[PDB]
Scaffold this active site. Structure first.
Site, PDB file in Angstrom:
ATOM      1  N   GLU A  48       0.827  -1.200   0.000  1.00  0.00           N
ATOM      2  CA  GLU A  48       0.000   0.000   0.000  1.00  0.00           C
ATOM      3  C   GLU A  48       0.863   1.252   0.000  1.00  0.00           C
ATOM      4  O   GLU A  48       0.496   2.269  -0.599  1.00  0.00           O
ATOM      5  CB  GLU A  48      -0.959   0.013   1.190  1.00  0.00           C
ATOM      6  N   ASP A 216      -5.989  -4.599  -2.728  1.00  0.00           N
ATOM      7  CA  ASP A 216      -6.140  -3.164  -2.529  1.00  0.00           C
ATOM      8  C   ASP A 216      -4.962  -2.406  -3.126  1.00  0.00           C
ATOM      9  O   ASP A 216      -5.143  -1.394  -3.818  1.00  0.00           O
ATOM     10  CB  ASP A 216      -6.271  -2.875  -1.035  1.00  0.00           C
TER      11      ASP A 216
END
Length: 618
Positions: A48, A216
């Protein structure tokens, strides 16, 4: 004045003295080494963080026309985060008819390790590997989520970075109960048989390599590449190679769209599925692929659980309806076209009576493909769970997931004027406006803890209002990364309603501006932005038994004895050299909670990205 803030936080992030980046150019999780989140050490790196890195120099390239930093970010991702071809041996031995072997999930870490089933359970079939190989090859173009930048755990040689894995033992294993181990196992450290015997129970153990992804991160990377390509085409820069890199990343991302063992979705049992009968067309929690070292075999798994905070409608739209991003495999566009619609219906289904998006769904009940309890609602046969995957702190207790998922939904609304999901967006915005508590001073407090009750109605293609699904806010805090995400979502609301509705909604735009201004004014810092945190859970720092299984003895590379009865600190003895350890010990001894000012890479990236996205189209 907003772009000035973006550029100043950009300079602070790229300043070598602040400690945000390492010698290789890899971002850290946080400047402060003593911080226990999903990453248990401050100077690790997450996928991320690299996705936010990509978005940050995508915005830098938009603002200045300089994509060299963005190009270097992609080269760093390919070199360091995406495993190299030499780091992926034995991947050509993969058998798409038999992708992987069966293993259960257990509610408590004490049940681990888990017995492995070889023939009692039949695994389904993978219908995408052959197309992927015929297009590119055996190697998978996906990131590994966690890496040790500076070899703090010492699993490698010298200063060179190492892939590591923490979350392996089910639902009730929080960060404080993880045992960090290297992904590329060479049997050097740990106990006998490496660290493998802690989690997966096998008759014979061999050298292995594993890689887990966080969809994600890949979704954010693909969305950042799409926006970078659009801004570059506005400038005139050619990014065809990196657009193709993101396109093949998106093509490989279709492994997440499937059940963990490729089984029929909604079957309520471990019934093997044929091709495309196991795809729930939703971004699952993870996919994991691996192989043997010195041997010729490989495996892949998806995930049954789907969390609303992981779905990215924008990425599905980009990968389905963009000729430039069209995957080389002929079937990629159709699969992404199906996934977009499935994700939108998922979002519509999960909304509560007040407006809060509940926790996602699952194809396996308790991780063991058991029958749903009486009265359980279903979404295309998938039961409803309030807190998916992780339950020790509550998966959907965190309010940042609401902003994270609704930002993607609203960006898709901005790009595609889809009238299907308007009422969802208005209800969620009304709820978040209701639950934000501003003050007459310059301070503010936004929800941090959420309590959910009830279940949504069983999906029949229409939204009934969910009279039985309720949410209430229990804790008000001052989190800055979540504030940045929420302001980003509100500004996206404002722009989308300006473009695809009667008139601009000034309330959301005004609230976003107020949040940004108040946060920046109150909490400016030398290393960025931060606010004090009570951090009660840090008592576990001195009292959390990490559950080493009895009779298993291993040695950490620095020499720590990993034995039953060990706490959080005992196997991380290099924390005692941390500058903030004496303050933590003093606060623990005298009783009061330890107060911290944390500078996370992703939090400052959210603040700057939200600032830039407020500057964009205004």
């Amino acid at each position: 004045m907003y772009k000035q803030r973006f550029l100043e936080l950009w300079e602070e992030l790229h300043d070598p003295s602040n400690g945000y980046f390492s010698s290789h150019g890899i971002p850290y999780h946080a400047v402060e080494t003593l911080i226990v989140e999903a990453p248990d050490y401050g100077h690790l790196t997450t996928s991320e963080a690299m996705s936010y890195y990509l978005w940050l120099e995508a915005l830098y390239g938009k603002f200045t026309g300089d994509f060299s930093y963005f190009m270097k970010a992609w080269e760093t991702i390919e070199k360091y985060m995406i495993p190299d071809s030499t780091e992926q041996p034995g991947m050509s031995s993969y058998n798409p008819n038999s992708p992987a072997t069966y293993a259960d999930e257990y509610e408590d870490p004490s049940y681990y390790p888990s017995e492995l089933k070889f023939d009692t359970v039949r695994v389904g079939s993978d219908p995408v590997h052959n197309d992927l190989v015929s297009a590119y090859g055996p190697n998978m173009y996906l990131m590994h989520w966690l890496m040790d930048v500076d070899n703090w755990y010492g699993f490698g040689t010298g200063t060179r970075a190492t892939f590591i894995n923490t979350f392996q033992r089910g639902e009730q294993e929080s960060t404080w109960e993880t045992i960090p181990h290297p992904s590329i196992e060479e049997f050097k450290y740990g106990g006998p048989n490496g660290f493998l015997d802690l989690f997966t129970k096998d008759r014979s153990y061999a050298k292995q390599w594993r890689y887990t992804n966080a969809p994600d991160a890949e979704g954010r990377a693909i969305q950042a590449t799409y926006w970078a390509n659009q801004w570059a085409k506005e400038h005139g820069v050619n990014l065809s190679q990196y657009v193709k890199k993101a396109s093949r990343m998106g093509d490989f991302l279709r492994n997440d769209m499937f059940d963990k063992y490729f089984m029929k979705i909604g079957a309520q049992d471990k019934t093997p599925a044929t091709g495309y009968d196991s795809a729930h067309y939703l971004m699952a929690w993870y996919t994991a692929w691996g192989g043997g070292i010195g041997a010729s075999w490989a495996w892949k798994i998806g995930c049954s659980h789907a969390h609303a905070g992981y779905q990215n409608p924008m990425t599905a739209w980009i990968l389905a309806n963009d000729p430039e991003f069209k995957p080389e495999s002929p079937n990629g566009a159709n699969d992404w076209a199906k996934s977009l619609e499935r994700q939108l219906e998922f979002y519509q289904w999960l909304q509560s009576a007040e407006g809060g998006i509940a926790g996602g769904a699952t194809n396996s009940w308790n991780g063991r493909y058991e029958k749903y309890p009486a009265g359980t609602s279903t979404f295309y046969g998938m039961a409803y769970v309030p807190h998916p995957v992780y339950a020790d702190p509550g998966s959907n207790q965190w309010f940042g997931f609401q902003a994270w998922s609704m930002q993607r939904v609203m960006e898709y609304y901005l790009e595609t004027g889809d009238s299907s999901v308007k009422n969802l967006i208005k209800k969620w915005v009304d709820w978040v406006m209701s639950e934000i508590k501003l003050y007459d001073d310059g301070t503010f407090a936004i929800p941090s803890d959420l309590e959910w009750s009830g279940q949504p109605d069983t999906w029949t293609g229409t939204y009934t209002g969910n009279p039985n699904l309720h949410v209430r806010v229990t804790s008000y805090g001052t989190d800055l990364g979540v504030a940045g995400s929420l302001a980003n979502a509100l500004a996206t609301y404002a722009a989308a309603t300006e473009r695809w509705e009667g008139k601009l909604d000034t309330k959301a735009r005004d609230m976003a501006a107020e949040l940004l201004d108040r946060m920046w004014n109150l909490y400016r810092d030398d290393k960025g932005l931060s606010a004090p945190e009570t951090r009660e859970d840090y008592v576990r720092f001195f009292e959390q038994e990490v559950y080493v299984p009895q009779g298993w003895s291993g040695t950490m590379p620095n020499g720590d004895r990993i034995e039953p009865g060990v706490t959080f600190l005992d196997i991380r003895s290099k924390y005692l050299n941390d500058p903030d350890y004496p303050k933590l010990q003093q606060a623990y001894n005298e009783g009061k909670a330890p107060v911290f000012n944390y500078h996370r890479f992703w939090a400052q990236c959210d603040i700057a990205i939200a600032n830039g996205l407020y500057s964009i189209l205004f």
